[PDB]
Amino acid sequence: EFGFFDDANKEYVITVPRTPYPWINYLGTENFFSLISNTAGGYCFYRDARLRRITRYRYNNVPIDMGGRYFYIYDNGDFWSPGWSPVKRELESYECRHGLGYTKIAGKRNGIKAEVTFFVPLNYNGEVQKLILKNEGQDKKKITLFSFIEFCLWNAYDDMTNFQRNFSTGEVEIEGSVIYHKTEYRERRNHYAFYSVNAKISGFDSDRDSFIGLYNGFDAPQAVVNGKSNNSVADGWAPIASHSIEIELNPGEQKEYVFIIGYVENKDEEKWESKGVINKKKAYEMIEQFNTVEKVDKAFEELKSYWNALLSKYFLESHDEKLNRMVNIWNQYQCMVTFNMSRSASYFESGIGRGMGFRDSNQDLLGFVHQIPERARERLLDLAATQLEDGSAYHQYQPLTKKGNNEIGSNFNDDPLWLILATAAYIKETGDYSILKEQVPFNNDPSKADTMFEHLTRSFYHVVNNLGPHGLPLIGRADWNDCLNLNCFSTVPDESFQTTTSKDGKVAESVMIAGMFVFIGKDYVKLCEYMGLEEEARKAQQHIDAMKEAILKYGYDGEWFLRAYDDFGRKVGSKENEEGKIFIESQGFCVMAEIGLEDGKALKALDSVKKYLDTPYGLVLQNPAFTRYYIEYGEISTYPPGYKENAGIFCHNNAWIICAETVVGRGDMAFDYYRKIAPAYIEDVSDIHKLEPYVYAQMVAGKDAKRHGEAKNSWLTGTAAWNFVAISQWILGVKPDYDGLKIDPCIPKAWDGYKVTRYFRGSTYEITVKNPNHVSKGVAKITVDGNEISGNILPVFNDGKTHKVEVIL
Amino acid sequence: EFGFFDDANKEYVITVPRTPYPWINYLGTENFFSLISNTAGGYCFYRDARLRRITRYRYNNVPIDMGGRYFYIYDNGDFWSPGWSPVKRELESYECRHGLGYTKIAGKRNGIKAEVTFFVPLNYNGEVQKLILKNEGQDKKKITLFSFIEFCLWNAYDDMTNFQRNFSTGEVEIEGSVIYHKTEYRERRNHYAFYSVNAKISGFDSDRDSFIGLYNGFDAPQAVVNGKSNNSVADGWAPIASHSIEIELNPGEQKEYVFIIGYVENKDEEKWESKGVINKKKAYEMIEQFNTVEKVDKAFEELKSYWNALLSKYFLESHDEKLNRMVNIWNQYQCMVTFNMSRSASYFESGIGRGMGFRDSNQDLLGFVHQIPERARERLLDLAATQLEDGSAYHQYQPLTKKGNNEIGSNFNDDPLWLILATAAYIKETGDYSILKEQVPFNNDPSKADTMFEHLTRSFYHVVNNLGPHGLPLIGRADWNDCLNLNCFSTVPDESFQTTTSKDGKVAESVMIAGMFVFIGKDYVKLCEYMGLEEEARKAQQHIDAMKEAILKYGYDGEWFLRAYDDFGRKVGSKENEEGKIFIESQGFCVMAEIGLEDGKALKALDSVKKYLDTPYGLVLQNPAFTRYYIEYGEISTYPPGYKENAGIFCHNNAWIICAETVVGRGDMAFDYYRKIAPAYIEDVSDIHKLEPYVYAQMVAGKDAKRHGEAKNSWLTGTAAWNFVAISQWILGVKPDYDGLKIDPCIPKAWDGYKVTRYFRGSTYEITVKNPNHVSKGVAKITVDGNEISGNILPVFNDGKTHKVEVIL
Ligand SMILES: OC[C@H]1O[C@@H](O[C@H]2[C@H](O)[C@@H](O)[C@H](O)O[C@@H]2CO)[C@H](O)[C@@H](O)[C@@H]1O
């Protein structure tokens, strides 16, 4: 391990700066966003990492994670950094606390302690850094403090490619203790950035080559080495911001400073104070907002209250402290962060993309719908507005413009069903059926607008109408697995596997889409019945039954469910195949659809999953891994064995196996699968996992990889939402439902019980589950407010009170 | 100064490594290309810096220029680099010789000297590095040598943006002393790279985090610090190549090693030696090709002979050694390099672009036509094949695919005339009129193909058919000045100034295009007369005369020539304007067209140019500089004053001013303009110039900038070609022409004379010019082989002999 969980403060405490990888945190809630590592590396942006990046950051750098908010303490020739980077001189003590929306970093050297709190306050377009300098020695000290950030030229791709122009465009202004970055403000941009401190400065620097030196690195800037600022004014090349303050500290005396990285937008008419001088009124207001430590503390407390209110809708009390900290703090926090950040910027996503997946946007809603219902409803309507008339969807949704990517296009045939699933989840959470009657346009065209229920109908009948030779849905470009491309057949290195199609797409089928169709058609039929359309519900049920028969006749291999048929009409995921005899997605979604429950097919498939796909670090996508390129399969075989979609552990689809295990009533298996990938349970092998031990990652190397157990692409994935749904609804049995809160746990037998406090439709339910006879599944009795009820659906109160619920299995 | 010229060896010798900016050189002639700095930084690629990059390089890095071919000498705990980078430990001696297609770097520390010669041999797909280690001390030594390169993932944009996939794709093999990089070779790619040394190694490394360490930089890799290789095999993340050799050196003993960075392409049926093992036959042949120092020396001598033959067609003997070294070595070398490299990769061009300008290829042809006439003919035909049917051209030409960029498009209305100018230059150089009768397609469509002369006709009549209200040519998106956008009117950031047009383009005219039309229509009329089309020649002359009258009536401001009219119909470049009262382009091209020679208008315009645009470092584009954004002008006013097109020194049009000065017979002024920007004449202010003192740069900061005199965007520009044409043809007076070689010098009066040896149409002319009366212009007598001739056109011999020519002014 490299740290520990602090549950009372809801923090992760990193105690050594050399983590196996830089472990990061996110700051900001609405528009200003910051990525900050445990050594204070990273960068910030305003609403768009691609088009409004404020500070410069280099991905895949040597050394890693160089560039950030760098403070230099200069003490009589010696100099060091509180985060131990970039200087990397040994510290008496180091600590990084990653909290909810904030990060604290403390470092000590030669009797001088520096503590910095970084956070983005609510309704504020800036990152606030509170710095405490304390003299813990026995002698009076004279030191110099240096701040440093490196600006980006607002357009990351242009900033890293277009030097022939942009080496001559960088412009700054320096006034008082504020350095303003105003590149291209003179022509078309109405926005600028600033770096300020709330104290009189001894000097400044705004030219990178003056502060650092051409042949020096971040670890030893020449101005810091010499102990004084050069007072350089930037002119092209690389604009930066640096203050220098000369401080005398008596023994036991401390001083406090507030540094602000701020973003300002001006109206085109109010752009100039005079000729060539930017208007600084908004920056003055922003800086005065946080010119004392007391105001910063008030904002910090308000952010704490905001996050506490966000996390308070689902509270678990069990005997397992790791489970408690996953359910109560970190899973919900990651779900909220994933809603705030989409898939834009991480230490693996470089921030140059244009949007996120349509299916990913729908799937995250299942995770965060219980925390932000109104924003979830707005997001659902926005996603539905981009749908095409035929019921298909744009593969990439852009939340910034609320539009679909026309360049990427459509023909990912699983995408429409996710909209129905997310809408059903929203309705079951809130009970708000009115969303079905909203007027939603098609293709963002107000002229052709219909009800939201009509959008769901088109989504259902897009699958109904695009059936293949066996009656299973046509896969198209791909399904949930974006690397299963059965219509590509690509031989040329530079073409995309997802948008290049050399086949008509009339043969290749997906049984994973078939399982999704059967699973989500129940919700569609229920919504048909709510709308008063009995014939429509009957016809939809007929189609669902036909799909179920098709899955039984052509989608089962004998001991597990098949994966697909290719353009040749050959089975994918069959025991007759040499490699890839069994995939994981079809098993999970077919068992979740209750197919094979009575004849033992589902149990056989789950036993096969355990036999062939199980590892100590999770379940691999398919077995055996592909050891060569398969032109008929697409991108999946292009990876080396055990990585990404070629038999890696995709923790996103492990949650479906967890749910399916709850379906057959095996709670021990479900919780054992849950524990293998939950961050709090692998904190003890953090060195093997190598990524953050407090958030889910997308991918863990499988048993065929030499790095078996190592993670990639952390912090930004649909794993958090689906795993929270699996643990909180399927295992713990607190399930939203159309008529109310359903209680149906499936837990390990040895558990004596637990309790969950759930806020649901305007009321609080304190549900205590007991297991006197140690079973896994089956409710014997439910009592509400002292009175026995019938069934497993709790009454809806909507009275703002607390109701005691007592459950005996 | 940071070095000196070595004329006998044709090298520039850099003597201090802390040079004001990394000074680079190019290696390779046909397909394999290398950029190498004076500290051995840079990278290689195969024909395409964008899609076939072999080694990784980080632009705009901190510290600058980190990453390259890094050799580490480990001596009993100490370690250092012969290029002084990346280790940056002080050396007893350092030297870098930049030659023609090769670079030598020598470094000495603690009695150990390391000398490395880098070059790409002819007809070889690899970079060869010959390393000599010498013990110059008095004691026997035991050392370890480490090599290091960092691989790229073949697609630089993908390599720097797509970590979510490509952190799991990196693959290598290690066999003997060769490390093979084969990422995606198991897949659609049929090419791989290798790093070899011709000796048994003590160890290797192929994983970056094992050789270097996650938190270490290039300056102190952990394997080098420990003095031992880790023998790591890469698996995803960052593949690298490193050998380690343990060497014992007696006093006075030296060892020799050959390192090769090689590129191999295999046939799809011969990709594998066995399952999972790449076929290494071509790599074995390539490595055996240079496994001894003698073979490397033979290849080095062959490269030297090739480069000597390339520069031998124009040889100057004057009293000025700086002029001699510019004309004989460095200008011609830069012209050939610019033909080989287009505008793809420099230390300012990041290698991500798709091609070069159509006008830029045409203009470079003028520079290199005397060195490679056959390749110039092929390039001319390739450029003409992309022309549209109406005579317009695609703005960006892509020499790799020999096609125009359809996304960028057309409507740059000066582009077609450059094709006529380049074709006329080729015909004047070679006398080969047959190129006019070649069948050339339109829009790369063989069905619609016509003669090359028909292409020139369409180019000529595009201007005739796109005249404006005053009879001057419509400017369209832009003319030669790509930042003068009079139809854009953009208020929104992140949209191209060159391809966004909010006006119909029926008002704005360009005086510069009018001057080009008059200047190049003479050549078009001559070519019309060659084909026997008398009526066509008469009609073309009528159009030229009409353009001349239009320029005289509407293009002259009273003291100088106007620049343009905008979409409002207002004068651009007029004394009535508050800023930008005079531009430089119109003066040069109108005087070159001989428009105001008799009435004193041309002399008046040149005097105005001297009065308003002249600086000690060159001539600025326009005066006064724009101090605010002008929406009606486009990108030109978006720069800060004195940079790029906003009153920077564009050395490209200084050559046109030099030619115009020769036209009015003022040789002192022309040579004074030539000297201000010629690299050999500013080597003494190298610290101010800051870029390479042996090649031209695109841009020097103007008198309105605080960095007045500083250069940007070196090594890749049309400045070299036009300046060589200005010095060698207009000042020295050796001008190719129809019917032969014309002698018409315009030189400073104080010169006594000079001599030029010129290879022209199969014969050599040794031309001695004498100035007994000390005039600037005017030929009194010409004698060939002892017999006085009439006129100033030399006879064509085509006999492979040398002919003595005496010219008396
Ligand atoms: O396959 C599951 C997951 O794939 C995501 O697409 C990735 C893919 O994982 C990767 O192999 C490929 O190289 O890049 C794409 C991104 O374009 C997809 O974004 C998810 O929606 C999907 O669940």
Ligand SMILES: OC[C@H]1O[C@@H](O[C@H]2[C@H](O)[C@@H](O)[C@H](O)O[C@@H]2CO)[C@H](O)[C@@H](O)[C@@H]1O
């Ligand atoms: O203007 C002369 C020169 O311009 C080149 O275009 C550059 C331009 O200099 C720069 O200001 C702008 O930002 O980028 C473009 C490149 O797209 C052009 O390439 C040359 O042909 C032209 O001679």
